[PDB]
Amino acid sequence: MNYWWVSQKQTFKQEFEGGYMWSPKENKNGTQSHYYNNMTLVQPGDVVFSFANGLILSVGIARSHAYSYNKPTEFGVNDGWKIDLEYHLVENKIRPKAHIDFIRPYLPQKYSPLQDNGNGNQAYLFSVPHELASKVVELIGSEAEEVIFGFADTTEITTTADAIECQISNDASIDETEKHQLVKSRRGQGIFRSRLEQVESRCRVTGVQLKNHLIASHIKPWAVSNNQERLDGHNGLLLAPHVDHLFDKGFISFEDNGEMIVSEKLNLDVLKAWSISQGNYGYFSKQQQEYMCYHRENVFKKL
Amino acid sequence: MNYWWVSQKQTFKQEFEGGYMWSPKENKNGTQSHYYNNMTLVQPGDVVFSFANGLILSVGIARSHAYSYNKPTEFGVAGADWANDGWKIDLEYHLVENKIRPKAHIDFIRPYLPQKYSPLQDNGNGNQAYLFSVPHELASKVVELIGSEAEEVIFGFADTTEITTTADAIECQISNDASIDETEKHQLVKSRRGQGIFRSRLEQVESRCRVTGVQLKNHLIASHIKPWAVSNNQERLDGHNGLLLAPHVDHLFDKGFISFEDNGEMIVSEKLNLDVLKAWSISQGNYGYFSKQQQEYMCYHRENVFKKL
Ligand SMILES: [Cl-]
Ligand SMILES: [Cl-]
Ligand SMILES: [Cl-]
Ligand SMILES: [Cl-]
Ligand SMILES: [Cl-]
Ligand SMILES: [Cl-]
Ligand SMILES: [Cl-]
Ligand SMILES: [Cl-]
Ligand SMILES: [Cl-]
Ligand SMILES: [Cl-]
Ligand SMILES: [Cl-]
Ligand SMILES: [Cl-]
């Protein structure tokens, strides 16, 4: 996932209401533009800071790649790049110049969105390097974190998995039954679900046994699992939907002997609100532990 | 959603272990029997009772239409080659602990058996064919005999499949529709999973899960009220056609286990086992007024999504 900083000093109102970003494709003199070319580098899931009227008004999430589209009609008045941007207004609408002594050390030598004095540069879309991105996020506060962790940063993972499902569904060589089972297993259906039900009986965390209230979740994700692992009843848990949400995204994981592990970026208010207690949720078998190790080391959100 | 009855006789274990059903597709002359043709009528999400050794052993959910596939095991007598090509269905088995013996309840079942093509004779002996249709009234009686385990498989689970199938087909149609504005297309598709302009607009009128109180954006699902699939394009992108919900509340609401009155009073379905609310520490009660714009959609939800009767 990449971060971008978009300077909309004079266009924000219109771009926010329409849920987009727009720029020309090239310079007036016909040459390639580093800054316009930034638009073609944006991927769904990427985080975009809206900088307008001196303020960061939104921490947004890109929902498209750049697509060719007509310049927006403005009242009283050639195709450019459009990006669908899912705006998220933040309560803490900050002015970056005020924190420049803290920010300056982490500004890039070239293509910086801010000058060394704290004033903005005059391009439209800047890349924000990852160290700097975290500093901006620090200043906005936890609401920027709400946009990112387990939200914006899940999108690229879903994109990758969507493409793996496409590779399988369109594979003209793979056995038809195998195709169906691998695809259905992604959403906890098919032989994977039946096999899991012979290993697990209930949601570890909430105790619910009712099959219509449980999600068949993989431990090692479906996307990175090989075909055996995708259909292995030992590579799963039956979880209540809110617990599936926390586990799938790596807000929680488990020790081999059952203790729930919590990510640094899980807000503890959530667990309080849903009456999920910390503690031990039972031994995992040796076969399950193989997968849970993978989850701890690759899915669980750990800086 | 339709119900079926598969008489698996002495090969339940192999068909269970393989997660399938298999039948011939035709007689030698190209004609189908009624029972071979039944395989071609099964749709994903349909419920299939596995009957073997006189017992109902599984309440399964079909996960495919019938597809051409070679006979999974050998015939008892080395048969003709044409007969090896049949219909396969991927069946998601769900074992039940309460294994009903239909013949021991024949007096209760007999009145609801069909005049023709029935899975059972009037004395409760099974018929010779493989896949039988179970009409809906007969199905309800079978479910009553099996009890809550059957209900668990069906309501909010098997019966959600056809709704997902429809929503998937619609997304495909929209995505490939050349006549739609490119930006509109992207917005309509993203809105299905609570993304894009729909979510930003919902955030202008709602701020938290009303049921759990959670305000954190990364722990909320942007749900529609009137479902995305049945909504028109204005309704799909309307921020008033939504609620922010914790994932488990999104689950209960989307499937119609709960709904809300216009003043926010939570309505709980008779199909909701109240143990679930206790296990997840969710209270009944009042969750605040909706706006007139939201009430339009909530009325639809109460009348068409909420599980009644
Ligand atoms: Cl050039
Ligand atoms: Cl460039
Ligand atoms: Cl400030
Ligand atoms: Cl200010
Ligand atoms: Cl840049
Ligand atoms: Cl297994
Ligand atoms: Cl461990
Ligand atoms: Cl016939
Ligand atoms: Cl076929
Ligand atoms: Cl008959
Ligand atoms: Cl008879
Ligand atoms: Cl019999």
Numbering used by the authors:
A (entry chain B): 1 to 77, 84 to 309
B (entry chain A): 1 to 309
What does the paper say about this structure?
Modification dependent restriction endonucleases (MDREs) specifically target DNA that is modified, and are non-toxic to a host with non-modified DNA. Many modification-dependent restriction endonucleases (MDREs) are fusions of a PUA superfamily modification sensor domain and a nuclease catalytic domain. EVE domains belong to the PUA superfamily, and are present in MDREs in combination with HNH nuclease domains. In all crystal structures, VcaM4I protomers have the predicted two domain architecture, with N-terminal domains of the PUA superfamily (residues 1–147), linker helices (148–178), and C-terminal HNH domains (residues 179–309).
The crystal form without DNA was phased experimentally. Except for the weaker diffracting crystals of VcaM4I with dsDNA, the resolution of the data reached around 1.5 Å. Although crystals without DNA, with ssDNA, and with dsDNA grew in different space groups, the protein conformation was remarkably similar in all structures, with the exception of two loops in proximity of the DNA (residues 24–34 and 72–84). In all crystal forms, the protomers dimerize via the HNH domains. The extensive interface area of 2000 Å2 (equivalent to 4000 Å2 of buried surface) and the classification of the interface as stable by the PDBePISA server suggest that the dimerization mode in the crystals is relevant in solution. The DNA binding site of the C-terminal HNH domains is consistently empty in all structures. The dimer of HNH domains alone is crescent-shaped and could accommodate dsDNA (∼20 Å in diameter). The VcaM4I alone and with 11-mer duplex generated scattering profiles that indicated ‘compact’ structures judging from the Kratky plot. At low concentration, the scattering data for VcaM4I and its complex with dsDNA were well modelled by the crystallographic structures (for the enzyme alone, with dsDNA bound to one EVE domain, or the mixture model).
